[PDB]
Amino acid sequence: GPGHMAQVAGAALSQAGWYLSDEGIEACTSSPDKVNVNDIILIALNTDLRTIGKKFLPSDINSGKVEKLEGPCVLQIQKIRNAPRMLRLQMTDGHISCTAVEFSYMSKISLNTPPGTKVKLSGIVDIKNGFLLLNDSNTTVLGGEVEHLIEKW
């Protein structure tokens, strides 16, 4: 019934790398009697993690003191700046901001990639002087957009 269905949906979300708060998951669920992980994910893709996400990044991730970050985990792109292409990404878990550099041959992130886009990081990601080092091996674009995204609330 609704209790066990919410439980198995919550398990599926965590297994996929999402870190949403309990209140966030309720917000993304259209009814306690119509729990559908696809629809929870669709709404979350198109929602600001500052509103629905749970903290999972280390507070000092930009300090240099953190050297690695293990996936799976879903992050949100706040801003993008521009042989493979190289982009600089400002990202957030909804609580802590971090910065990445991304090298992509297959070109699935561009400077046109909308703010609010979600990406999933997989495996162990190196962080070199505060920059996460991303490439096509450890980064998957999940999509979504957060319209009219404001970087600083």
Author numbering: -3 to 78, 91 to 161
Quote what the paper states about this structure:
Topoisomerase III (TOP3) is a member of the type IA topoisomerase family, which functions mainly in relaxing the supercoiled DNA and in resolving recombination intermediates during meiosis and DNA repair. Eukaryotic TOP3α and β are unique in that they interact with their specific auxiliary factors, RMI1 and TDRD3, respectively, and coexist with them in the cell. We determined the crystal structures of human TOP3β TOPO domain, TDRD3 DUF1767 and OB domains (DUF–OB) and their complex at 3.44 Å, 1.62 Å and 3.6 Å resolutions, respectively.
The N-terminal DUF1767 domain of TDRD3 is composed of four α-helices, followed by the β-barrel structure of the OB-fold domain. The OB-fold domain of TDRD3 contains an insertion loop between β2 and β3 (Val79–Pro92), which is 23 residues shorter than that of RMI1 (Val95–Ser132). Limited digestion with chymotrypsin cleaved the C-terminus of TDRD3 OB-fold at Trp161, which is positioned in the middle of the predicted α-helix. This result suggests that the C-terminal region of the TDRD3 OB-fold domain is unfolded in solution, consistent with the present structure. The insertion loop of TDRD3 is completely disordered in the apo TDRD3 and becomes ordered upon binding to TOP3β with some flexibility, as judged from high temperature factors. Comparison among the two apo TDRD3 structures in the asymmetric unit and the TOP3β-bound TDRD3 structure exhibited two different conformations around the N- and C-terminal ends of β3 and β4, respectively. The Arg93-mediated hydrogen bonds stabilize the shorter β3 and β4, which might be appropriate for binding to TOP3β.
